[PDB]
Design a protein around this nucleic acid. Sequence first.
RNA 1: GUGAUUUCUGCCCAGUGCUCUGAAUGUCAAAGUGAAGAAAUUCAACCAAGCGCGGGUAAACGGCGGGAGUAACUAUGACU
RNA 2: UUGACAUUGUGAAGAGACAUAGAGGGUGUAGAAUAAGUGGGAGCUUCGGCGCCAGUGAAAUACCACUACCUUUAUAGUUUC
RNA 3: GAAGACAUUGUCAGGUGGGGAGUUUGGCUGGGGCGGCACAUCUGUUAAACGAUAACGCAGAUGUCCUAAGGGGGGCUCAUGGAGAACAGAAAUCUCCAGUAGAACAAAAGGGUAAAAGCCCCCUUGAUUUUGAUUUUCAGUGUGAAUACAAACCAUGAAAGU
RNA 4: GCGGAUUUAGCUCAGUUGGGAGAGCGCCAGACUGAAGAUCUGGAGGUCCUGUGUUCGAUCCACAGAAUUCGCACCA
RNA 5: CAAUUUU
Lengths: 135, 51, 106, 105, 204
Amino acid sequence: NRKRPVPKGATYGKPTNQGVNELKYQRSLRATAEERVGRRAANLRVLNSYWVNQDSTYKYFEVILVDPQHKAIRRDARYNWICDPVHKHREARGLTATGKKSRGINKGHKFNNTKAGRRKTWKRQNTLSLWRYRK
Amino acid sequence: GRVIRNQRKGAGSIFTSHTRLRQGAAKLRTLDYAERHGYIRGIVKQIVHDS
Amino acid sequence: GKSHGYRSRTRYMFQRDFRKHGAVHLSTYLKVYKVGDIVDIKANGSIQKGMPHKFYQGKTGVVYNVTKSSVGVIINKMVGNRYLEKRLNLRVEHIKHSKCRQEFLE
Amino acid sequence: VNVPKTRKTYCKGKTCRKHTQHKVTQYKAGKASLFAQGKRRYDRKQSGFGGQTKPVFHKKAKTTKKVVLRLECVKCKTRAQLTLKRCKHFELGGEKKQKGQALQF
Amino acid sequence: VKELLKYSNETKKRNFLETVELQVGLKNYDPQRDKRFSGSLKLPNCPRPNMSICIFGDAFDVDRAKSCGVDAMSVDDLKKLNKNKKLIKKLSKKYNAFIASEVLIKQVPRLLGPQLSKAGKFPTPVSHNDDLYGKVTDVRSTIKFQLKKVLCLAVAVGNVEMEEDVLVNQILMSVNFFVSLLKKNWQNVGSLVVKSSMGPAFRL
RNA sequence: GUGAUUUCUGCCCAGUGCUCUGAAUGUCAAAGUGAAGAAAUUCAACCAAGCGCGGGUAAACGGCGGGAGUAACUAUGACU
RNA sequence: UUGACAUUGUGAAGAGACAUAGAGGGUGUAGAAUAAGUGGGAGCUUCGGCGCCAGUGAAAUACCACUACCUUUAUAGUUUC
RNA sequence: GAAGACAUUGUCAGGUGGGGAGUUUGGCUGGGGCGGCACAUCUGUUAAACGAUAACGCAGAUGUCCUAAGGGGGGCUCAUGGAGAACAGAAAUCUCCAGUAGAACAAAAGGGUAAAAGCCCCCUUGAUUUUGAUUUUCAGUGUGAAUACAAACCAUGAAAGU
RNA sequence: GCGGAUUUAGCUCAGUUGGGAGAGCGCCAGACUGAAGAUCUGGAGGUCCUGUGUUCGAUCCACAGAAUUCGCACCA
RNA sequence: CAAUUUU
Ligand SMILES: [Zn+2]
């Protein structure tokens, strides 16, 4: 479990946030096995990743990843979305496999408040629209 | 309150031991083969003051 | 604390008006109360079952319904700016007929 | 206060609707509670941090609690209630108090 | 069930060696506590009789003792004052009548040790006097139970065959159930053993 | 924690705090086992640490009061 | 600080515990005996001993039909330290 | 070399924890604090002869108790005083006469009561059930409390009734 | 609230088939010694917290109550 | 094993 930094365990707030030692870190444990690959393999692109082993305290993942600028990948049209620079670091902004379930996006009645990304569907309904010819 | 003065000690801030006149580590040799199967003959050179 | 009981500060109004002790005189049970009649109120401390309140003493009202020993009457009472037609409920001993509507009747 | 048994009174019923026998008893709360809506809407708020959401009670002032005796019919075997007012000591048995013979200081 | 044809078909026939009257008895297993809640109670219905050999200490002197003469054993009067103090110690069944509704003055001295006292544990002045003739000689437990359990009767006559011990056994099954709570264990009767006098041991 | 030297450091461990290699069910978590029922679930037993129990502890926190009777006239009480 | 679970793999011995079989004994009186049971009986037996219709004791007295309470014991089946 | 599936590491559960955090710590008050409750109630009075009314004014009380001390019916005279009868006296039980209440009615004060509402017997559970109206406090809100019914069921009495 | 624990002549141990209220200590008497002392014995006290069951009968096996603590929790 | 007083 993640615990927040908080020098010598002081919260400085109302007691609902006072507890320290058992926070949860809402992103997955796999998606933080992708950033620290991605921020040293900065020129590569990561397509997806998976699970391999679990000892006492490590949970190994084995990330597969793609060269965008390789000359066999800029041609050979099965994989010409990776060179298109909209997918520059498509793990750090969360759009990989766990970037599309821990971010929360699925169809349905029980994936509702995170159906098309939470922050868009927060600031679109507790805005208030005012027309010219107010209704 | 404050951190009382046996808590601000254990941080290495100013309470680091004064280490200018310590001549060296007062500790003896490790087990070579020549120590647990015979003898090797040492010779004292000088006696000093380790401050 | 303070006295705001149901029959507080009314020592002198429920005495049965000395040398007039004993039970009720039995002309009070051989007398009719039809609806529309006009009556007064005078409380007797003989029966502790159906007094009018401390306030409703010596005031005149019309009756509106009757039951086996009961007469409900209408009294106007004020609160600052208005009157309200109260609708009380009394045992029939505490009531005399108001002898004021003969000199208008006759 | 001394109360008897056998309490012959009006059953609620649909069978008799009439004065029948009622052998009285006296009840406590039974099982306290579990999984009953306002208990597990409450364990949702206790779980986690903060602690002691809904008000605990410290200022007690009473001494007697309102003995309530539940009836029990013997023909249709239903169960009605009634409440006596507050008393400190309450039995359910005998000593039909005879008049003032036995004083003996 | 305790017999479909299990262990009560063949072990009843080569014990025709003691010609003494053979009735195999019965107990069961029900634990209880130091209270006296629901033990040896619940007078059951056993239609097959005992053809018993005991005495009846009758208290009935109406001239329907014609009917008590053919339905009972010993016809006494109400001179019970001085004799019956420590006399009967082997007595199974007694039946008395409506004249003795208050004449229990001189039976409670003797009914303390054999313990068939005329309290609510042995109610002999029975109102209805027509059901209480034929069945009631049969042995069935009407006693104050000792500390944990007494649940007894004789199973059947070893001489009298098994014509009704597949259906009266089913109402031999219903004794201890419907008054106490389920503090009683389930399957009180289990492995059935038969020994009147001659039978060996067998566990079902 | 007291504050050179000299000379002393009296009595009290019931309260509070600390400690102990003492013994029992007296209470005592989740998990685990067993019984019922068709299950969710209920009930029971085992119930670790710690409390509790008993001891140790004042250069540990601290505390140091009363009341009777008794000595040749009183008085006071060495004494119980 | 303490316990549970993973971490975490392969063994022997000891000791209980648990049921499953079986086992022996067991207080104030008497009855016929160191009398802790039951509903009852009156006989199978080398005895005609013990019973009973006999005494008396809270009790009925040979037999458990089923165990009350033991471990004191024996083996494998459940595991546990 | 040690040590070894015990430790360590992680999750969950109990215990300890002013080290640390957040907060709170009433009100009325002849300043405030202390004292008290005048912070809900009730009785008599100050209250100024309808009603309403104050002060940390006055003298008191409440946070209960009751199988009867409730309900009904029948039946008796109370506290005291005079007069008498063995022990019997200042105080014992029995009797006569006077006896407007000077006694009693669970609990403070005030009202009330005489073939009773006091005391002695007999029988009982209306100390039920369904909802409404009404009076006092009131803003004419609620809670508390009480009055009079209707629809039922019953208890007592000879019934009227209660 | 809720589960245990104990109540004994004045006080403390007693007391467990259930047959037994006993010891000690407090008032009074006898002994002992030449006598005073100390020491010895005796006189008496008891509702075994109460009520009901349990049983031949109970402190003893229970349930309810009164009192005394131990703990353990805690949405009006 | 323990033993106090006798103007
Ligand atoms: Zn009914």
